[PDB]
Every structure is written in C-alpha cells, then in structure tokens.
Curated annotation (Swiss-Prot):
Record protein name field: Tol-Pal system protein TolB
Any one of the GO BP annotations: protein transport
A Pfam match: TolB_N
Gene3D superfamilies: TolB, C-terminal domain, TolB, N-terminal domain
Annotated localization: Periplasm
Species whose genome carries this gene: Escherichia coli (strain K12)
InterPro entries with a match to the protein in the record: 6-blade_b-propeller_TolB-like, PD40, Tol-Pal_TolB, TolB_N
MF terms (GO), sorted A to Z: protein domain specific binding; protein-containing complex binding
Keyword field: Cell cycle, Cell division, Periplasm, Signal
Quaternary structure (record): The Tol-Pal system is composed of five core proteins: the inner membrane proteins TolA, TolQ and TolR, the periplasmic protein TolB and the outer membrane protein Pal. They form a network linking the inner and outer membranes and the peptidoglycan layer. TolB forms homodimers. Interacts with the peptidoglycan-associated lipoprotein Pal and with the C-terminal region of TolA. Interacts with the trimeric porins OmpF, OmpC, PhoE and LamB. Can form a complex with Pal, Lpp and OmpA. Interacts with colicin E9.
Length: 397
C-alpha cells in the first residue's frame, strides 16, 4: 500500500472530540487497499495545519504525504471539519488539496468520508466510495420480529432499520439511484419480491408467483429489474420492464439459473447455473442469444457481481478444495482468491471496484467482512446484536 501520514485532527471545544476524524480518514484509505497509513503509534509529530508540517520528519520516512485536520464547534450546535493534505516527498511543504465542511454531529463521520474521498481521488485518480452505504439482513435476538433489513455506511456505522419482519428477509438490491431496495420477504407466508422506497418506507409489490422469487438486481440504467423465479420447477431468469411492469423470461430449462448481475450495458447478465453439473457463472444478453459459460477455473463458481466498469467480477469460488471470494479479470481471464475466512458468501462490490463486502460464518452465526479487491486488506465489520447476511453495496450516492 502507498505510504501516507494521517494526523489526528485538531480539536477546539468541549474537551474530547465527538468523533476521531483523522482516525476515519486513515481507516478509509487503509480499507481501500490503496494506502498504508502510519500507525498512530509511529507518528513523528502531531501537527495541526499546512504550516506545522515538517516534511523531513515524514517526506523522509517514506511518506510523501500527510493529512492534517481541525474539528471546531459552531454556536448553531454544529461543527466545522477541515482537512489539509501536505505534499512532502516531491515538493515538501506544498498543499495538494484542502477543504472545510459545516455539519451536524450526526454528519461528522460523513464529513470524515468526504475528506477521504477527496484525498483518495486526488492521489489515485479513482473516485472514492467512502460515502456509500450497504444494505443487509440481521437476525436479532428479539422474538417477535427477528428479521431486520438494515442499512449503514459501508464501514458499518450509522445503521438504521428499513424493515422488521417476523419472517425471513433476504437478498436486498439497490436501485441505481440509491433511493430504493428490492428484497425478498416471506412475511406473507410464501416468497415475494418487493421494492421499498427508503425515504418513504413505501412498498411496491413486484412478484409473488407460485414457488420461490428471489435474487433481485436492478439494471445500471434504471429501466429494468432482473430476478429468478422457480415457478417452472427450477430457477430461471426473468427481467421486468419497470416503466411498463412487463415481465419477460430469459432462460428456460430443468437447470437452475439464478443470482443475476448486470454488465454496465444494462443488456447483458452474468448468472449462476448448474447446467454443467456443479454451479458455474454464465453470461447472456437478455434480448437474445444462448448463454455462454465464462468461468473455467475452479471446481465451482457462483453468485457473481460484475464491476461498474465491467473490467472484472468477484464471485464465490472453490479452489484447492476451499470456498472463498475470488475475482476474475473479464478481459484476460485471470483469477485471484481474495478472502481467507470460513464459508465465504454473497460478495458485493463497491461502486469504484476497490473493495468487496461479503459474509462468512462465525460460530453458530454469521458476520460481514471487507476485503480490498487487490487482496491487500482484510477486516471484519463492527459486530451488531445479531447474525448478519446478504450484504449489498450501494451505488454512488
Ligand atoms: Yb449476488
């Protein structure tokens, strides 16, 4: 990872800042796998601005850039979060980027992810995804409504419940605009696919044919929804035109075809099929043509997620007898196992393709994990009151 210094932000008010901003920026950069922040334990100093920054102390220590900041109170009850990125190495002392934000204590972490998104894109030329969110299902220890569809920042904080249920909920999927979630609920007794508007809580009932309805995915252009129905005896792909409520069948047969994911063209799909025996990933244009297998490595591959630029995909894969999240380059065919935990499942990619969120078993339970797509960084998300599954990473917001 690219060395970088991130200094704890300056605090000027009721002793003890409400949020460690520097800590959030360091975690974000580290989380992407693109940077290696100096441990707070080795910082050669704790400067407060684009002046107290002495390059040789850093510019020397293999760090050609430091982040400094200041968190100051407002009479309005809000706060002012400001950061400055100093260019040691090359032109020591220079300020490469800086900014300041007025936010409520509720949005302190958001201001922290805004700084990191700015610093990340200025230094890497890749748009940051630190202000994104994730959706997931938590089975708590409450008895009436054990299942809860929740949403939080990609890093697990600031979570909120979208919906509580007495019956199982699964496979949330974000609309491309980030305003709605599609998911499967068994509340009515049988499987049902619904779309819920986050702001409103309004729920649109989409499909509840006989049998199982599940694994939804919105096309990137917003005009269609793909999913799998097993009303034919086995799962097959259907796509619904959201502007006309129209539904078309895409695959047919005795084989199971499910877990669709869209290529950037909103016309092609990668999906899981047990056609060849053990699950493998195939691709098909929904307008026509025969599906083509695309995973030839590994004994088994499934539940793919194609990146936003279509350069690669991540999936659940079996290599050397073990199942982990792996990624496959869609141009070269190169494959690389990214995770190393137990029973890795349902991987979802950040909108900039730099991180993947997935679940793994934990004792009798389940938790979420993040692994950078270059494979460098691995971390468990914050624990919550319950076992967690089916994470879905939101598009840019
Ligand atoms: Yb998936």
């Amino acid at each position: 990872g690219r060395p970088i210094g991130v200094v704890p932000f300056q605090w000027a008010g009721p002793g003890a800042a409400p949020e460690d901003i520097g800590g959030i920026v360091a975690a974000d950069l580290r989380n992407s796998g693109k940077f290696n922040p100096l441990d707070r334990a080795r910082l050669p100093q704790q400067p407060g601005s684009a002046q107290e920054v002495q390059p040789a102390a850093w510019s020397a220590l293999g760090i050609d850039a430091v982040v400094v900041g200041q968190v100051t109170p407002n009479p309005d009850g809000s706060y002012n979060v400001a950061y400055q990125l100093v260019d040691t190495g090359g032109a020591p002392g220079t300020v490469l980027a800086q900014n300041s934000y007025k936010v409520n204590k509720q949005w302190l972490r958001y201001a922290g992810h805004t700084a990191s998104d700015e610093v990340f894109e200025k230094l890497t030329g890749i748009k940051g995804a630190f202000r994104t969110r994730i959706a997931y299902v938590v089975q708590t220890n409450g008895g009436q409504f054990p299942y809860e569809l929740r949403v939080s920042d990609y890093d697990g904080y600031n979570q909120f419940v979208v919906h509580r249920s007495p019956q199982p909920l699964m496979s949330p999927a974000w609309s491309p605009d980030g305003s709605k979630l599609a998911y499967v609920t068994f509340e009515s007794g049988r499987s049902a696919l619904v779309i819920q508007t986050l702001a409103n809580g309004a729920v649109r009932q989409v499909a509840s044919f006989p049998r199982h309805n599940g694994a939804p995915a919105f096309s990137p252009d917003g005009s269609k929804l793909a999913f799998a129905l097993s009303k034919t005896g086995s799962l097959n792909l259907y796509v619904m035109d959201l502007a006309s409520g129209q539904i078309r069948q895409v695959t047919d047969g005795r084989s199971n075809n499910t877990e669709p994911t869209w290529f950037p063209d909103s016309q092609n799909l990668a999906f899981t099929s047990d056609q060849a025996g053990r699950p493998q990933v195939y691709k098909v244009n929904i307008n026509g043509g025969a599906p083509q297998r695309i995973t030839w490595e590994g004994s088994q591959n499934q539940d793919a997620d194609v990146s936003s630029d279509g350069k690669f995909m991540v999936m659940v894969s079996s290599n050397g007898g073990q199942q982990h999240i792996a990624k496959q380059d869609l141009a070269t065919g190169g494959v690389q196992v990214l995770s190393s935990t137990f029973l890795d499942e349902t991987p979802s990619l950040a909108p900039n393709g730099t991180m993947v969120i997935y679940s793994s078993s934990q004792g009798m339970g389940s938790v979420l994990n993040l692994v950078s797509t270059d494979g460098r960084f691995k971390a468990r998300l914050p624990a919550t009151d319950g076992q967690v599954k089916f994470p879905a990473w939101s598009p840019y917001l």
